[PDB]
Coordinates of C-alpha atoms and ligand atoms in Angstrom, one line a residue:
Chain X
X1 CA -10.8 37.8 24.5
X2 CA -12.2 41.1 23.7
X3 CA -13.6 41.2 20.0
X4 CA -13.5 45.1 18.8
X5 CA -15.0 45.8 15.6
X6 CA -16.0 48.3 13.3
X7 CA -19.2 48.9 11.6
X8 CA -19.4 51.2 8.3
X9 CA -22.1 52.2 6.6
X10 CA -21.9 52.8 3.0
X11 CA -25.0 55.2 1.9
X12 CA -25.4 58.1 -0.3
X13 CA -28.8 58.5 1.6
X14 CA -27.4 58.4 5.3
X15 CA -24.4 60.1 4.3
X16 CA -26.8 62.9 3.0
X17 CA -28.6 62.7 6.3
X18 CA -31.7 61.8 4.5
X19 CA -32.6 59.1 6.5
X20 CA -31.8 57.1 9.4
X21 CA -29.3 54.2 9.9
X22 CA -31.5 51.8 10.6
X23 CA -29.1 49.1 9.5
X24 CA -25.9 50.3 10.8
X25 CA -27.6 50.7 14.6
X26 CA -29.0 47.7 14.8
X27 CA -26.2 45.9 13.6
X28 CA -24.3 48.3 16.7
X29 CA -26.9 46.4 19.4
X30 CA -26.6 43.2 17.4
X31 CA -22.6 42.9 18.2
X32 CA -22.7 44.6 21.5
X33 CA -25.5 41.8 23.0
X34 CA -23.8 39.5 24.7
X35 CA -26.2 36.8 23.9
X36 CA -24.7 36.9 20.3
X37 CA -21.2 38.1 20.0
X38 CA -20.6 40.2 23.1
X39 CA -18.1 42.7 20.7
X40 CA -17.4 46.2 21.4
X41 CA -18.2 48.5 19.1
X42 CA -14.7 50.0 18.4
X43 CA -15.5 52.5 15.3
X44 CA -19.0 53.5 13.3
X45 CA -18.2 55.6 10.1
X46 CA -21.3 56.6 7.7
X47 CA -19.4 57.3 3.9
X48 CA -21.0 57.6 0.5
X49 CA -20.9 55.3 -1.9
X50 CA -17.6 56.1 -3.3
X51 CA -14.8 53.4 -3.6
X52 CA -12.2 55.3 -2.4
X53 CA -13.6 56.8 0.6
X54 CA -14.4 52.6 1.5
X55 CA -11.0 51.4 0.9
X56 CA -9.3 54.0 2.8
X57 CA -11.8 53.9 6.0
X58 CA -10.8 50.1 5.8
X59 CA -7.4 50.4 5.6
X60 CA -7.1 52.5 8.3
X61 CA -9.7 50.3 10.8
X62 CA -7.4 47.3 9.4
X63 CA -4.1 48.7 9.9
X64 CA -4.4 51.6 12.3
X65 CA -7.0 50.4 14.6
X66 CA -6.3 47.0 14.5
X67 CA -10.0 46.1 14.8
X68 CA -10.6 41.8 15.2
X69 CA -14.4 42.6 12.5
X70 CA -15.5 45.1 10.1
X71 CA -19.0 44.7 9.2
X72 CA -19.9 47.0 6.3
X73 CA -23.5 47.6 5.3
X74 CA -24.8 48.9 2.1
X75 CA -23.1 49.1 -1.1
X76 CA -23.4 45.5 -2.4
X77 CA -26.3 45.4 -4.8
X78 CA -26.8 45.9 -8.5
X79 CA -27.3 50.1 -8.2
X80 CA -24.4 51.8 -10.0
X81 CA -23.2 53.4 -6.9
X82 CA -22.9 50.3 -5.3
X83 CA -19.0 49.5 -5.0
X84 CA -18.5 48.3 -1.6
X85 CA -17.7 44.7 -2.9
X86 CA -15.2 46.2 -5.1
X87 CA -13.5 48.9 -2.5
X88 CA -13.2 45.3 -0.3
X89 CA -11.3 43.4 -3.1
X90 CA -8.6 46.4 -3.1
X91 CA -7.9 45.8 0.5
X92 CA -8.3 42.5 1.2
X93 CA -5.3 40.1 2.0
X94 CA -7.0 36.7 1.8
X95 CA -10.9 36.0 0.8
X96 CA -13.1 33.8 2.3
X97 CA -15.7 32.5 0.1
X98 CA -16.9 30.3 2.2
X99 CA -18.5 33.3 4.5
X100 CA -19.8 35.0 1.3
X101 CA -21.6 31.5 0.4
X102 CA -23.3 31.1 3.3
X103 CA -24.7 34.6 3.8
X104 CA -26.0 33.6 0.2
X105 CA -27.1 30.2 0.3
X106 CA -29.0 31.8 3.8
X107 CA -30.5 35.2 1.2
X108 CA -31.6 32.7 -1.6
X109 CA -33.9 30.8 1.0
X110 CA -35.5 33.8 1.8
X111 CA -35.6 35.0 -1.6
X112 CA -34.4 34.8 -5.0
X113 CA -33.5 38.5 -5.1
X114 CA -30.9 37.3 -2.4
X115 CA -28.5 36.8 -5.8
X116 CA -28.8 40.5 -6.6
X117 CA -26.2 40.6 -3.2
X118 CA -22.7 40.8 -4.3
X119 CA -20.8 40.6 -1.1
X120 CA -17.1 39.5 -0.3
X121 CA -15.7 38.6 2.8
X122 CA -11.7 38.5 3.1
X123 CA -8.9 39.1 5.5
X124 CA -5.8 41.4 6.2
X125 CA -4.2 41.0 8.6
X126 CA -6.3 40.5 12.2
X127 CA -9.0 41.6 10.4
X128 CA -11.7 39.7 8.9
X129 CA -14.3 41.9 6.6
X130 CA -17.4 41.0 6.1
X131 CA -19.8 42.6 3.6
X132 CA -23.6 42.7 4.4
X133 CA -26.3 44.2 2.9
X134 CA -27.9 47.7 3.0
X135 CA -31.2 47.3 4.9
X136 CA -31.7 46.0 8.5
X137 CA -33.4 43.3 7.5
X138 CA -31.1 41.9 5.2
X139 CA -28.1 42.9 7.3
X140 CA -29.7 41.3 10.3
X141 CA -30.2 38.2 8.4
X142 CA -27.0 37.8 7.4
X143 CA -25.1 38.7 10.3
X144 CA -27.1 35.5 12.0
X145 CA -26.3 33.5 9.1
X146 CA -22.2 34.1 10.1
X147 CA -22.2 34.5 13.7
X148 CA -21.7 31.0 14.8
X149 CA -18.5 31.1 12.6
X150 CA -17.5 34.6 13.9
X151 CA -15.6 34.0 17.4
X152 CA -13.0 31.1 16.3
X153 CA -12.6 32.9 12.7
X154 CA -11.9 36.1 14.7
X155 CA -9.4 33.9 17.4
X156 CA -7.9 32.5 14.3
X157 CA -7.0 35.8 13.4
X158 CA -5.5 37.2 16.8
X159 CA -1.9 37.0 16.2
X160 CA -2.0 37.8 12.8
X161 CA 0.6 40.8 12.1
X162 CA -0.2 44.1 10.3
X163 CA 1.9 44.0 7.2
X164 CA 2.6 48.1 6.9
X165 CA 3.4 48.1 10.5
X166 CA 5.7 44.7 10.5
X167 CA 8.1 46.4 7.9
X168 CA 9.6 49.0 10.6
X169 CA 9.9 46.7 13.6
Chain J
X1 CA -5.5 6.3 -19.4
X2 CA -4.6 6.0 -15.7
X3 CA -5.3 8.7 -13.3
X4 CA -2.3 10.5 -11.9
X5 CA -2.2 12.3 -8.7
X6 CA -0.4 14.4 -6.5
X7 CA -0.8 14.6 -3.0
X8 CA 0.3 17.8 -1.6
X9 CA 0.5 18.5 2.2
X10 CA 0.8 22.2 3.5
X11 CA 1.6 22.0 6.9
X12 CA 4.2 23.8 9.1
X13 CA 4.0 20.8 11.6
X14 CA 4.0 18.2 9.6
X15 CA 6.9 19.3 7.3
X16 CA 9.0 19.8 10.9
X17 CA 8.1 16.4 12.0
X18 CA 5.9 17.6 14.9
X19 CA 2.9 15.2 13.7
X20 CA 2.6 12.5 11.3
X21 CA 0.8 13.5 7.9
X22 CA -2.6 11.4 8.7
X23 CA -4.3 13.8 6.0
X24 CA -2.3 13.3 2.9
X25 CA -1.6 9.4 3.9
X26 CA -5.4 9.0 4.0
X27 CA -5.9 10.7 0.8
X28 CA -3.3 8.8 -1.1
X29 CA -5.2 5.5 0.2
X30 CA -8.6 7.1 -1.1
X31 CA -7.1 8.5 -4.4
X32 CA -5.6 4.5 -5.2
X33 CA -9.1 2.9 -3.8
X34 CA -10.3 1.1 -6.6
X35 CA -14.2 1.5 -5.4
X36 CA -13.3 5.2 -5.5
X37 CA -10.8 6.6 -7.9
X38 CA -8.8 4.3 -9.0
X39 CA -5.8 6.1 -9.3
X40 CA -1.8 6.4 -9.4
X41 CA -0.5 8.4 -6.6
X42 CA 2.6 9.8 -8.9
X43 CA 3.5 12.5 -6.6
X44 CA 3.6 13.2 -2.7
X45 CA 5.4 16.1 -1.1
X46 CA 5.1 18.0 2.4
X47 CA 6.0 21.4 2.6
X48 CA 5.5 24.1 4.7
X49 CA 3.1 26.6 4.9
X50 CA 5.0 29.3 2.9
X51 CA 3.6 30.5 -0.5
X52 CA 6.3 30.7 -2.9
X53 CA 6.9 26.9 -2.5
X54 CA 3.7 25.8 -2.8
X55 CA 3.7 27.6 -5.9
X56 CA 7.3 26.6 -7.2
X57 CA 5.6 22.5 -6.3
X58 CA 2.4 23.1 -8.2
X59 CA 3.9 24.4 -11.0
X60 CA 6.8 21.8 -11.4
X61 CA 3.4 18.9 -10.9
X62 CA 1.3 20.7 -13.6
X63 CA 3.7 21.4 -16.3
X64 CA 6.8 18.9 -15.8
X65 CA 5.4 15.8 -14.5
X66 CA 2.0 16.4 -16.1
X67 CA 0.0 15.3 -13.3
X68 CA -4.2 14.7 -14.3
X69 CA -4.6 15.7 -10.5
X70 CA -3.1 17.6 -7.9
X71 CA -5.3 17.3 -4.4
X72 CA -3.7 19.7 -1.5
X73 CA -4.5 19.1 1.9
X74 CA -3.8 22.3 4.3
X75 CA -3.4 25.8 4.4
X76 CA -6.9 27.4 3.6
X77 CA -7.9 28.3 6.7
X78 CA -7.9 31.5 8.6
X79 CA -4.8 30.6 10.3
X80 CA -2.0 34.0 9.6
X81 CA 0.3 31.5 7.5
X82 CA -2.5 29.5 5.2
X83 CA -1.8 30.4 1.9
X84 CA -2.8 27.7 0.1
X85 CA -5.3 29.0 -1.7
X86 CA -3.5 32.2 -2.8
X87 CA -0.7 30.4 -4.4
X88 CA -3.0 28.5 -5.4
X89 CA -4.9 31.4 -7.7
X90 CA -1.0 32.7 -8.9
X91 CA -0.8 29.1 -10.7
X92 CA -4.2 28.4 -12.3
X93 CA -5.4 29.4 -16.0
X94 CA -8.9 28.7 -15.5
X95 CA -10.9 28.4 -12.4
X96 CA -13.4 25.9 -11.3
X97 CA -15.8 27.7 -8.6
X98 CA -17.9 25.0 -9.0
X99 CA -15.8 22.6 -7.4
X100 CA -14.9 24.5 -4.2
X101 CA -19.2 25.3 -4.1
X102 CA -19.8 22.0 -3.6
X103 CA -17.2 21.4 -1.3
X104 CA -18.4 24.3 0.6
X105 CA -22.1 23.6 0.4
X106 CA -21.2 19.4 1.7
X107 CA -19.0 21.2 4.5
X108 CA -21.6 23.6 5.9
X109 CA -24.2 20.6 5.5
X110 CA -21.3 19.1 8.8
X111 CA -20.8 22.4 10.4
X112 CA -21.0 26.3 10.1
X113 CA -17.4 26.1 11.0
X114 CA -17.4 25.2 6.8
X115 CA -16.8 28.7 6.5
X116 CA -13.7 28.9 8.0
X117 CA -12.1 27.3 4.8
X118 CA -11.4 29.1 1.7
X119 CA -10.3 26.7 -0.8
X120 CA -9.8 27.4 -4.6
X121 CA -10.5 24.9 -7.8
X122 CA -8.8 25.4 -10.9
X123 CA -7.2 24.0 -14.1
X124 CA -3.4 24.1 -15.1
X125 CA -2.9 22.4 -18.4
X126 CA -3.7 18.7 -18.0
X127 CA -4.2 19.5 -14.6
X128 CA -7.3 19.6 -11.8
X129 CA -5.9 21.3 -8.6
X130 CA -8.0 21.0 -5.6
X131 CA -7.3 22.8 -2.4
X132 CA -8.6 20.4 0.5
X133 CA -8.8 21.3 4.4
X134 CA -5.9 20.0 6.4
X135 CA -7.8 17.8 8.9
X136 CA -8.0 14.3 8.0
X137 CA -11.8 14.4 8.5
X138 CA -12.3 17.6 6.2
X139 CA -10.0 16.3 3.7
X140 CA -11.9 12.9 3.5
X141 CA -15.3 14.5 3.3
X142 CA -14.7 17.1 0.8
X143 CA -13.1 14.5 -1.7
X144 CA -15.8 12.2 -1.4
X145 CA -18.3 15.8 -2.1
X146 CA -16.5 16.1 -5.4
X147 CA -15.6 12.3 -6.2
X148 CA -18.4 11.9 -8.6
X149 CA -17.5 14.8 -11.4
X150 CA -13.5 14.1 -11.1
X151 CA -13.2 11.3 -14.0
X152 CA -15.3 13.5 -16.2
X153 CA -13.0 16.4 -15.3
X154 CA -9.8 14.9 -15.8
X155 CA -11.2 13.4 -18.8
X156 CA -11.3 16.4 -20.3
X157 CA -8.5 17.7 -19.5
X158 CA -6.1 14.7 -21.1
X159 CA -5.4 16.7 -24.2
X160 CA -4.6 20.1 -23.0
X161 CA -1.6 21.3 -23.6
X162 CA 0.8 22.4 -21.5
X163 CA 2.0 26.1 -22.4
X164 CA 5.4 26.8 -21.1
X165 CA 6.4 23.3 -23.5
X166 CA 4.2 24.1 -26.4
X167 CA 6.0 27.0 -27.0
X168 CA 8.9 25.6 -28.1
X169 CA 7.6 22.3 -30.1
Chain R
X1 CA -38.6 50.0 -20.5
X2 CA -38.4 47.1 -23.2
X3 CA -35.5 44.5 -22.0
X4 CA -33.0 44.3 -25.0
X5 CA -31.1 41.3 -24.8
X6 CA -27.7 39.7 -26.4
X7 CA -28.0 35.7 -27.4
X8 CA -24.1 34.9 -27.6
X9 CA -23.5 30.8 -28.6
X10 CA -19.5 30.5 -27.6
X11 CA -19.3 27.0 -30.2
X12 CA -16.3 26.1 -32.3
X13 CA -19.1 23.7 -34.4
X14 CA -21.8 25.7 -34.6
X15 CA -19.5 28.5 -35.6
X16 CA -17.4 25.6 -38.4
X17 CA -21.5 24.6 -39.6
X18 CA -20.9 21.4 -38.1
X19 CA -24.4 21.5 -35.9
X20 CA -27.5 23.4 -35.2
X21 CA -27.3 26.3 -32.3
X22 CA -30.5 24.5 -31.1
X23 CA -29.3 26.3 -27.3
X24 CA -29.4 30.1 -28.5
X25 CA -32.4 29.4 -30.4
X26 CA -34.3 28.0 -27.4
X27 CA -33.1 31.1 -25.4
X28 CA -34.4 33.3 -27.9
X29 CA -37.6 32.1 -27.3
X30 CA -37.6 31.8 -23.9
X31 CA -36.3 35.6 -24.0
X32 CA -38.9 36.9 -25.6
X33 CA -41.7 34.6 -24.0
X34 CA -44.1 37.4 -22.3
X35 CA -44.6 35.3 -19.2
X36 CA -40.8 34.7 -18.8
X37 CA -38.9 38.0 -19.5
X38 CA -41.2 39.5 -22.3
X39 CA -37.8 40.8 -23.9
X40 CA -36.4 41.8 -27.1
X41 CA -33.6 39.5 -29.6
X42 CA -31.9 42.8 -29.9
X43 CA -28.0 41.2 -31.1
X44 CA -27.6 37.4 -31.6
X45 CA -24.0 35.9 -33.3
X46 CA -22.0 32.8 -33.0
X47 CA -18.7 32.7 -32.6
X48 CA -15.7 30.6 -32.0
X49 CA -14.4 29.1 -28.5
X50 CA -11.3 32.2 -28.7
X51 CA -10.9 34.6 -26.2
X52 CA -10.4 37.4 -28.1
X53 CA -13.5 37.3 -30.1
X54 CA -15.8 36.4 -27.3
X55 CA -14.2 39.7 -25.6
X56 CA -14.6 41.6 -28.9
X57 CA -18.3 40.8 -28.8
X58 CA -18.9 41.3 -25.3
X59 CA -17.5 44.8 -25.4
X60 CA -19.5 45.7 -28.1
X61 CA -23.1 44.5 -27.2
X62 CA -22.3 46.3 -23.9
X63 CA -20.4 49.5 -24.8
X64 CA -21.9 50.5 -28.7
X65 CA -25.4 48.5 -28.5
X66 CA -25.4 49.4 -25.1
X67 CA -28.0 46.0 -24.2
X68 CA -29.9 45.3 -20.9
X69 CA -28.7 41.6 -20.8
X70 CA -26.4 39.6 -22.9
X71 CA -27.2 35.9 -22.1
X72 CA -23.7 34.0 -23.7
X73 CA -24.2 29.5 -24.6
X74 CA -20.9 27.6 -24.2
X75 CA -17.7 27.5 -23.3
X76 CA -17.7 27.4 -19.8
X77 CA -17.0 23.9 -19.1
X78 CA -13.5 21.9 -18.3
X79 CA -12.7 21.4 -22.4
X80 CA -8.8 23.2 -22.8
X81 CA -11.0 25.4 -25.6
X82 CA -13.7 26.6 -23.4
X83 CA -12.7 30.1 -22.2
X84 CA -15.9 32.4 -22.0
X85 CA -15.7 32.9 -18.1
X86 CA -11.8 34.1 -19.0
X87 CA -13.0 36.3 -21.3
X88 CA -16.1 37.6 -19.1
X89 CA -13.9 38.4 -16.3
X90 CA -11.7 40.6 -18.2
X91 CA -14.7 42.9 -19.5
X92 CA -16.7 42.8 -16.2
X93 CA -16.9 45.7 -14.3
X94 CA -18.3 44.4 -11.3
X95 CA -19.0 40.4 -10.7
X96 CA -22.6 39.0 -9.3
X97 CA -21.4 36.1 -7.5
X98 CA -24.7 35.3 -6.2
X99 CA -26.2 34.3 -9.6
X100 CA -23.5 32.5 -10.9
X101 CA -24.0 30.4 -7.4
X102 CA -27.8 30.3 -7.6
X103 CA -27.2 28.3 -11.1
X104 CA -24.7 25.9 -10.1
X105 CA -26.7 25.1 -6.7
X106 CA -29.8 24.9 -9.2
X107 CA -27.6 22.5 -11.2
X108 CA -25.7 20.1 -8.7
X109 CA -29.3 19.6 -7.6
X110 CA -29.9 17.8 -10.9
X111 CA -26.4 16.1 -10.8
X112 CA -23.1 15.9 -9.6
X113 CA -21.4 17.1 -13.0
X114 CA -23.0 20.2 -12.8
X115 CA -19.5 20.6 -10.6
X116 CA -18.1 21.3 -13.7
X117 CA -19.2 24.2 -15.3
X118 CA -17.1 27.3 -14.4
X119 CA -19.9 30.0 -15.1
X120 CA -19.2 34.2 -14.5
X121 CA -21.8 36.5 -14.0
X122 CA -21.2 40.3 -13.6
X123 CA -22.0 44.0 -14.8
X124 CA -20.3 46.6 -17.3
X125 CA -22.3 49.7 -17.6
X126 CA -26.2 49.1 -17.9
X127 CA -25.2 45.1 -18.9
X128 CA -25.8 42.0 -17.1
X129 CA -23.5 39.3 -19.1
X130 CA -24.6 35.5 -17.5
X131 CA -22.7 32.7 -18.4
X132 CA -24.6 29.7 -19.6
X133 CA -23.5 26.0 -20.3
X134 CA -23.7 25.0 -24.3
X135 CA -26.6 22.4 -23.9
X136 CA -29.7 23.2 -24.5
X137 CA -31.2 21.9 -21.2
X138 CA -28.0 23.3 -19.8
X139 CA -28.7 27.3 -20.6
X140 CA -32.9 26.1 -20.1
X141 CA -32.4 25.3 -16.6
X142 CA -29.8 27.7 -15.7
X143 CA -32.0 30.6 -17.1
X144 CA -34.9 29.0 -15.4
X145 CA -33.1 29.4 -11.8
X146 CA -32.1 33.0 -12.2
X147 CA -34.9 34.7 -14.1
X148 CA -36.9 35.4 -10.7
X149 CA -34.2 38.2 -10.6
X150 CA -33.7 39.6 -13.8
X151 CA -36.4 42.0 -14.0
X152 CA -34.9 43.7 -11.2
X153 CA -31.4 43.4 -12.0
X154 CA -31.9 44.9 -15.0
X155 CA -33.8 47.8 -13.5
X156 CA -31.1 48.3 -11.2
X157 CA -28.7 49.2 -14.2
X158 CA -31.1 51.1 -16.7
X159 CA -29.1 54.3 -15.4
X160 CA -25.8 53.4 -15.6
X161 CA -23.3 55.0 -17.0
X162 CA -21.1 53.3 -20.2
X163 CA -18.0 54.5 -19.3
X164 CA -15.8 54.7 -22.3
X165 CA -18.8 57.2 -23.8
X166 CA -19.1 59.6 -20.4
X167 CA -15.9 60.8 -20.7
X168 CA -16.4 62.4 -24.1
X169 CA -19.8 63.7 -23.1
Ligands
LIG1 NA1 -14.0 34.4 -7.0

């Protein structure tokens, strides 16, 4: 019943230890209270904004780790660093637009600047992805938006198999 | 200028006789409702859920038996073998995000569990293909969401051509 | 810090003389209205409803005239001509999936049909290309419901780099 999952934070700025992860720890506390999802927090990874450095931390938390949720944070928005969306369509094995919608429909009632958010959420194998954005607030937002979905989409996803791993067994 | 439809259920239980098809029997009565659609059911198949023949099916519907409509019920959840919606994208020429918004937006209106479904909307030819939720319930609710804009869309569809047979007339 | 802007009208008549562009007029003045966008009619053209020409253009505007925002008017419904969210996707960079969704939630508030426009939105270099419906309230209303973001969009990607020209400088 455990639910272990990664979180990675994707910023030039924290990678460059010029300022603090606000996002990425309080998205940490926000997984770990069980209140909300009672997850462990099973990897944290700060990377720059670089597409390759994304795809292969989630490939490895996908297929190595085997984590159930990978929340990403940063990386989404209009700046021309901002690839995380991109990195996430390389990996992914199935999307789930539905997830993306709501974290949208849930930004644009805040504010219009909510369509400036590019996120995708997907799948591969017991993995779901979900891509939120770069400051606590937002990513705080939008985690709530998701989380009454979260535990049957991650039970869904339980017996799933790793495809890399399948192959030689 | 009849409305021709195929019904397609994707559903491992269904296609081994473990359950009756209650989705795809409901939807053919809706699709020939005459306060509703109005339409010809022309095509009903159950198959498993197993992408290359969902794909081989769709195809044969589009471009041999020049269906106006396909409507698929199963197969776009989170569940490891729904694939609907991935063979669904190999077949399509033009996509119709549109459709699976408002699908989406009606669904989470029911339930955050809305989320959990990741349909795709898109044109083959002559064709509207509609992925639909496997449940009976989902797959009544989210026709009736797009009921409304499907005689415009098929419509305009009625002249398309279909490619693989243009090319050699 | 002007905001030069791209008016493309994707119309097989008012390319053939057959009507009036009355829809990229209006957006040129809505454009340029100071209490709207306060930007420049930097490239306007008409073209046909063909792939290749609408990709031609796009590349163009984006890569040589190197424009803040192309706005393009038609094409994007069901009609077996209407390709300009084909063509967008293959010169897109990176998609903004949250404005193409603020429009059509903006539109199936007015009705139903507004199901059935398949609009693309997304980035290539310092360009934000928006897909807008032909009509003239169609491409009115759907400008209306994202231009509470565009000023900041479009700051966001005053830096970036136009890839085909970096790697000969
Ligand atoms: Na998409």
């Amino acid at each position: 019943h455990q639910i272990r999952v990664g979180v990675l934070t994707v910023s030039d700025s924290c990678f460059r230890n010029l300022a603090e992860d606000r996002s990425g720890i309080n998205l940490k506390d926000l997984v770990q209270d069980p209140s909300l999802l009672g997850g462990t927090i099973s990897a944290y990874k700060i990377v720059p904004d670089e597409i390759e450095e994304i795809k292969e931390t989630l490939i490895d938390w996908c297929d190595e780790k085997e984590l159930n949720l990978i929340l990403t944070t940063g990386g989404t928005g209009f700046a021309p660093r901002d690839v995380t969306p991109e990195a996430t369509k390389e990996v992914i094995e199935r999307e789930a637009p539905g997830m993306a919608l709501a974290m949208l429909m849930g930004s644009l009632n805040v504010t219009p600047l909510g369509m400036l958010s590019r996120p995708v959420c997907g799948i591969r194998g017991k993995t779901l992805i979900i891509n939120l954005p770069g400051s606590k607030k937002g990513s705080q937002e939008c985690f709530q938006f998701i989380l009454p979905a979260l535990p049957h989409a991650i039970d869904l996803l339980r017996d799933a198999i790793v495809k890399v791993k399948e192959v030689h067994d």
